[PDB]
Design a binder for this molecule. Structure first.
Ligand SMILES: CC(=O)N[C@H]1[C@H]([C@H](O)[C@H](O)CO)OC(C(=O)O)=C[C@@H]1O
Length: 658
């Protein structure tokens, strides 16, 4: 099939282009596909790209448009007043505006299909919505259509929703094209996906990217594989990883670093409507917020993340309990058995489940997978699946037996419903990952564990010291290992905030000198300095020239290997906005070599100030390029929940930022 119409080079300068007598006659049949290569870097707040209308008096609501918002949202309207139909479908954060000081060419494919009664929209190869209706309205069945327009919808003789942008190609087909035919449409994409809907994780959502350059040249990525929409824990979540052996050009199929099997790995399309979006998987264990580092001495690659027991997240996590009973200097995991109201057991050496009440070992052991064995025989539980088939979220047993784990809901022996940290290690730089182990508590028996700061750990350049920053209430708590991850001690730093999400990332400015950048509740990024290689920390200061919202966002920061303008350089990645998680920037800081202060000298614009940018991972690639893996959406907004393929990868050179 050829196009029924094909246009090219249309300038949308707040003035509509009429294409009625090129298109309307050729429209026929009830199925259509719009293919549109458009640009829009200074978009109006709301603006229609393409529009078919009844332009006559009294039929203002008789029209189809493809519209966008300056927030990056894309959508369609299919309206007909005589039929009593008024369809509106959209997805936030669907568009790119600008990459490297250049308008991005978006590729839009809208599929209007009468056989399935489905309206499907792709932008840039990604499906952003797909909606089935009871009563289908072909876009060309709207009664009295007499205008085909670009850059407005002609309503009762006047231009509505005037567009500022440009259309490079618009085609229409009297055919609803196959998914196969969509993926053969060429793309000029400024981004690539490392993790995506459909890959081997089978999660439809991803949050909290990380990136790290290993010594071999491999770049490694970790992420939350988030199953229950984009919701934090409590949910189903796994830590997935992927690596690139070619400077970011290609990535390996994702694997798991940490996983749980109490709930099935399901690609689900969450619930974006207001009655159902807060549906949140409630019976599953999960991992959340990973951080990665390489150990120089052993060659190991170390990855930590938070571990949440079935049904737990930071909201309901038992503060006032670590999950451990200390016994002169040693820490043991506490266990609660079925039918008991108190925690009567601990996991002594070799995983011996020991009864603290009667002071006797039992027939039960916990293996290194935290799986429960009775007299050496594996115990199992039945797995859960999730579905919205009944019109609300159901969590129900699915027939499959999986090894029974102390973190699960159906386990005979359960861990304290609080939050933990675990580490895994790889000895092949991310090709496999050893079974995770729980870190001991750092703040006593009567305190829940700290929360890991997503991103990178710090591997000091001239020692064997590893550091992972964590946060808790009223302090930054650095975890420090001088033995390849075997042992850990804490180094506390008081922060002048109560209930901060003080997500912290570190740079080593010169040997022994660490600057930590972190999120606060002040609308500003904070920082402190150890000159101690992390033993002691300074008071808190703030960065001017960057704004954050009051709740803040995770900040990522790296020490660039090369000199910029003759100075040592620090790179920082954050949203720069007081209005939302949007207006993302890599900001380039030159270290003054005398006092260690930083002149934040260049601000690079990742996309339009109005376009979403949230958590972010950066790294210097072996070729001195910068890799960015970031959430291209507002991951705080209750309007942008549950979007697929918004965590994206881009490649930048220093020249691009300066
Ligand atoms: C452990 C955990 O739940 N971390 C989540 C964190 C946390 O909820 C904080 O308390 C509120 O910002 O919030 C966010 C966020 O997008 O802001 C992401 C994290 O994955």
């Amino acid at each position: 099939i050829s196009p029924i119409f094909q246009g090219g080079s249309y300038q949308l300068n707040n003035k509509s282009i009429d294409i009625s007598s090129l298109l309307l006659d050729k429209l026929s049949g009830e199925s259509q596909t719009v293919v549109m290569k458009f640009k829009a870097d200074k978009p109006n707040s709301l603006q229609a790209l393409f529009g078919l209308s009844n332009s006559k008096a009294g039929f203002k609501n008789n029209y189809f448009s493809i519209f966008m918002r300056d927030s990056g949202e894309i959508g369609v309207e299919i309206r007909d007043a005589q039929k009593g139909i008024n369809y509106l479908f959209s997805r936030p954060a669907s568009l790119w505006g600008k990459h490297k000081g250049q308008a991005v060419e978006n590729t839009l494919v809208f599929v209007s299909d009468s056989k399935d009664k489905t309206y499907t929209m792709y932008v840039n190869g990604i499906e952003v919505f797909s909606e089935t209706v009871d009563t289908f309205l072909p876009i060309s069945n709207i009664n009295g259509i007499d205008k085909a327009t670009l850059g407005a919808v002609n309503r009762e003789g006047k231009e509505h929703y005037l567009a500022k942008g440009s259309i490079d190609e618009i085609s229409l087909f009297n055919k609803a094209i196959s998914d196969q035919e969509v993926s053969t449409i060429p793309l000029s994409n400024p981004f690539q996906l490392i993790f995506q809907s459909g890959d081997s994780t089978q999660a439809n959502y991803f949050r909290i990217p990380t990136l790290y350059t290993l010594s071999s040249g491999r770049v490694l990525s970790s992420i939350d594989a988030r199953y229950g929409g984009t919701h934090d824990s409590k949910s189903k979540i796994n830590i997935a990883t992927s690596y690139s052996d070619d400077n970011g050009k290609t990535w390996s199929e994702p694997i798991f670093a940490m996983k749980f099997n109490d709930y099935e790995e399901q690609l689900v399309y969450w619930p974006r409507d207001n009655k159902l979006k807060n549906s949140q998987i409630s019976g599953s264990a999960s991992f959340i917020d990973s951080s990665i580092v390489e150990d120089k001495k052993s060659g190991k690659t170390i990855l930590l993340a938070d571990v949440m027991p079935a049904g737990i997240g930071n909201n309901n996590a038992n503060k006032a309990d670590s999950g451990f009973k200390e016994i002169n200097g040693h820490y043991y995991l506490k266990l609660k058995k079925n039918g008991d109201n108190d925690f009567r057991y601990t996991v002594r050496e070799n995983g011996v489940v020991y009864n603290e009440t009667t002071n006797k070992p039992t027939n039960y052991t916990i293996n290194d997978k935290y799986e429960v064995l009775e007299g050496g025989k594996s115990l199992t539980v039945e797995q859960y699946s999730v579905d919205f088939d009944s019109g609300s979220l159901r969590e129900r047993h699915n027939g499959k037996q999986v090894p029974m784990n102390v973190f699960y809901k159906d386990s005979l022996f359960k861990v304290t419903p609080t939050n933990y940290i675990a580490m895994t290690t790889s000895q092949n730089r991310g090709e496999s990952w050893e079974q995770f182990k729980l870190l001991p508590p750092f703040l006593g028996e009567k305190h829940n564990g700290t929360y890991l700061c997503p991103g990178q750990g710090l591997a000091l350049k001239s020692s064997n010291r590893l550091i992972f920053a964590t946060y808790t209430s009223g302090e930054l708590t650095y975890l420090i290992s001088d033995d390849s991850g075997q042992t850990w001690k804490k180094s506390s730093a008081s922060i002048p905030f109560k209930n901060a999400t003080a997500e912290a990332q570190m740079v080593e400015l010169r040997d022994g000198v660490i600057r930590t950048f972190f999120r606060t509740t002040t609308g500003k990024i904070a920082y402190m300095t150890s000159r101690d290689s992390g033993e002691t920390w300074s008071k808190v200061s703030y960065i001017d020239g960057i704004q954050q919202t009051s709740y803040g966002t995770q900040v990522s920061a790296i020490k660039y290997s090369q000199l910029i303008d003759g100075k040592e350089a620090v790179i920082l990645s954050t949203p720069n906005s007081r209005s939302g998680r949007k207006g993302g920037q890599l900001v380039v800081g030159l270290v003054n070599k005398e006092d260690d202060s930083i002149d934040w000298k260049y601000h690079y614009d990742i996309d339009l100030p109005s376009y979403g940018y949230a958590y972010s991972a950066i790294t210097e690639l072996p070729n001195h390029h910068i890799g960015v893996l970031f959430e291209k959406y507002d991951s705080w907004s209750r309007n942008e929940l549950h979007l697929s393929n918004v965590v994206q990868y881009i490649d930048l050179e220093i020249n691009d930022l300066t």
